[PDB]
Amino acid sequence: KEQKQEYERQKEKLKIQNQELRDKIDGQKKIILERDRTIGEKEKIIYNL
Amino acid sequence: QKSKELQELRLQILRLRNAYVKNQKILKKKEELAEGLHLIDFEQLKIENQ
Amino acid sequence: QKKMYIIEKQFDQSGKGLKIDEFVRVMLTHLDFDKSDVQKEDQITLALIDLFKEIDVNGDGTMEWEEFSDHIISLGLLRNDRSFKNVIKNYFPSEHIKDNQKHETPIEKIVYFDKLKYLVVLEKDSTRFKVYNANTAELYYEVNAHKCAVLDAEYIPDQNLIATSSNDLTINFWDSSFFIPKQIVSVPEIQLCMRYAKWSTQSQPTYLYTGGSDSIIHIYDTKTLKEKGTIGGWNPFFKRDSQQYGHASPIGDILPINIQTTLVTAGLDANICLWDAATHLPKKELRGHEKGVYSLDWSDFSPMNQCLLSAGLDHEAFVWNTYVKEKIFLLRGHNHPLIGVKCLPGTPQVITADINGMVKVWDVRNFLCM
Amino acid sequence: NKMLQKEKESHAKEIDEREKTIRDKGRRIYELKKKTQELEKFKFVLDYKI
């Protein structure tokens, strides 16, 4: 029973790794696209100027 | 060897002196005011100084 | 204005409005420009074609003298509006406001508590801070803030307190409702600047940041009024591998940019450390000033015209961008060291003042000495 | 966990570099604004002088 309890924390850490690796990344793409759109908007002002 | 050495010395002195004359000419030619309107600006400015 | 009637005559000569070619040709004959020079010939042709298209409301490609006169009328009314936008009227001297109290010593500092209207003036070598009216210079109380010279007097709205920092190593928060010192806090060092930072985020507690001679920003929560942390500064004792972030001179000022959550610290070393107030770590170090930077303002007239404005030992004010490291603009014409740069809220007017009473009011849309 | 560790990575450097490009293009925007402003005044100045 103690061994099962000890390996329960191992399983919990494993699920933690699973979720962390499954985590957003997409959230980090979106900032990239926002910055690209701002870059493109800045390019238009540059060309007009 | 001494004649040849003085000869490249003459080459380098002549080219350096020509670069010198060009550098004083550039220094004088940089009289342009700024920007932009360079001479006419102070010409009209010189008009008011008048 | 001499050729106005001649242009009218030539335009009426068309009888059905001048098309692009006749329109441009008439203004080319009449204009005080270089018809024979291809550069301005083509540039004026393009400008007049743009004018023609703008006048083109019917879309038929004909600009009648009626339309041209209407456009001239609109431009005349706009000129009537004698700014061409956002009239920045000159700051005239206040004919109605002047000092009244007998300042026994020279004015050291003046912090205008807009929330309280308490224009607390800390007198040089005077142990009392005289709080006047920013609108009438009317001193409320001459109350002994501390035991020695007072460096800064900032309003903590979070506790309705006027915090005064003194060289006696003390900070006295006085309840503005009664101008009595609510809390006296001792500090290991004297803080030269002391600014209440209430960052925009709702969850960030308000921090009275005090920049002392050590260049370390001591952070006092406006509730307990006590130190709880120290920001990076020139600390040779802490000799380790940490990168040199901060300033090598005493903190002159602390600028809480709540919009960007940035604690800006300007040092005598000419550095302007932008510290991430969320982490108080350096987000950046603006540089380009020749000597110690003393005053910082944040011209927020427009999001596309946002400009930090820094002044100090330098006789000119540097414009800075949070992204763009290089100084955006430099206000010229100043004859002496600039006391600081102010960015009037709600207006594009930035005031830069020299030590000799010379003030330049600039339009951030152009940063010109309006 | 092993498959997801093989999976997860990236895009922080991309966010930062895109912010950098925004910065550079704003720099150029203001540079060209200043150049255009410098050239605008000369037009009216030269019309007035003519």
Read out DSSP for D9-32?
A: ---HHHHHHHHHHHHHHHHHHHHH
Q: Are C284 and C322 in contact (CB under 8 A)?
A: yes
| Contact in structure between C99 and C134 (CB atoms under 8 Å) | no
Distance CA C201, CA C204 (A): 6
- Write out the two tokens for B41: 């600006």
Chains that touch D (3 or more CB pairs under 8 A): A, B, C
D20 to chain B, closest Cα gap in Å:
29
Q: Residues 2-41, chain B: which have Cβ within 8 Å of D?
A: 35-37
Cα torsion angle, D38, D40, D41, D42, sign: positive
Half-sphere exposure in the Cβ direction for D33 (13 Å, CA)? 18
Q: How far is D5 from chain B (nearest CA, A)?
A: 58
**Chain D residue closest in CA terms to C33:** D47
Report d(CA A48, CA C19) in Å as an integer: 27
Token output for C294: 């003393």
Query: Which residues pair with residue C293 across a beta bridge?
Result: C312
Counting Cα atoms < 13 Å in the Cβ hemisphere of C100 gives 12
Burial of C338 (0-12, 13-18, 19+ CB in 10 A): buried
C135 among annotated binding-site residues: no
How many Å apart are CA C255 and CA C325, to the nearest integer? 18
Rg (CA), chain A: 23
User: Count of CB contacts below 8 A, B vs D?
Assistant: 6
Asked if the Cβ–Cβ distance from C324 to D37 is below 8 Å, we say no
In Å, how far from its chain's centre is CA C141? Answer: 30
CA distance A45 to chain D (A): 6
Place of tokens 């990076």: C232
- Tokens in use for C314? 């330098």
Helix/strand/coil for D43? helix
CB atoms within 10 A of CB C360: 19
A35 by Cβ neighbours in 10 Å (0-12 / 13-18 / 19+) ranks as buried
Burial (Cβ within 10 Å: 0-12, 13-18, ≥19) of residue C303: exposed
Q: Flag whether C60 is marked binding.
A: yes
CB C320 within 8 A of CB C367: no
C54 assigned ligand-binding residue: no
Handedness of CA C309, C311, C317, C318 (dihedral sign): negative
User: Which two structure tokens, joined as six digits, stand for C236?
Assistant: 């040779």
Documented resolution in Å: 3.6
Looking at residue C342, its amino acid is K
Q: What is the DSSP string of chain A?
A: -HHHHHHHHHHHHHHHHHHHHHS-SHHHHHHHHHHHHHHHHHHHHHHH-
Both tokens of C215, joined, read 């260049």
Task: Kindly report the backbone phi and psi dihedral angles of residue B2, in degrees, each rounded to the nearest multiple of 5, phi listed first.
Answer: -65, -40
State the Cα–Cα distance between residues D24 and C325, nearest whole angstrom: 10
CB atoms A20 and D33 under 8 Å? no
Residue whose token pair is 């940019």: C257
Instruction: Report the run of H or E that residue C170 belongs to, with start and end.
Output: strand C170-175
CB pairs under 8 A between A and D: 68
C-alpha span between C71 and C85 (Å, rounded): 18
- Closest C-alpha to C329, from C317, C341, C313: C317
**Residue B12 DSSP SS3:** helix
Strands of C317-320's sheet in order across = C293-299, C307-312, C317-320, C330-331
Specify the 3-state DSSP secondary structure of C293. Answer: strand
Residues of D in contact with A43 (CB under 8 A): 25
**Residue C152 known to bind ligand:** no
Across-strand partners of C191?
A: C212
d(CA C362, CA D1): 60
Do at least 3 CB pairs under 8 Å connect C with D? yes
Place of tokens 């800064």: C152
Burial class (CB within 10 angstroms; exposed 0-12, middle 13-18, buried 19+) of C263 = buried
Contact D45 B35 (CB under 8 A): no
- Indicate the helix (H) or strand (E) that contains D38: helix D12-49
H or E element that contains C248: none
To the nearest whole Å, the CA of D39 is away from the closest chain B CA by: 8
* Contact between chain C and chain B (3 or more Cβ pairs less than 8 Å apart): no
C62 is in an annotated binding site: yes
Measured between alpha carbons, how far is B5 from D16 in angstroms, rounded to an integer? 59
Amino acid letter, C170: T
C155 vs C140: CA distance, rounded Å: 15
Q: What angle do CA B2, B8, B11 make, to 5 degrees?
A: 145
Which of C157, C162, C124, C159 lies closest to C140, judged by CA? C162
**CB nearest to D27's CB, from C32, C324, C366:** C324
Handedness of CA C81, C82, C88, C93 (dihedral sign): negative
Best mutation site among D21, D27, D31, D36 for testing chain A: the one with the most A CBs within 10 Å? D21
- Approach to solving: cryo-EM
C33 and D27 within 8 Å at the Cβ level: the answer is no
Both tokens of A38, joined, read 């701002």
Find residues 25-44 of chain D whose CB sits inside 8 Å of chain B.
Answer: 38, 42
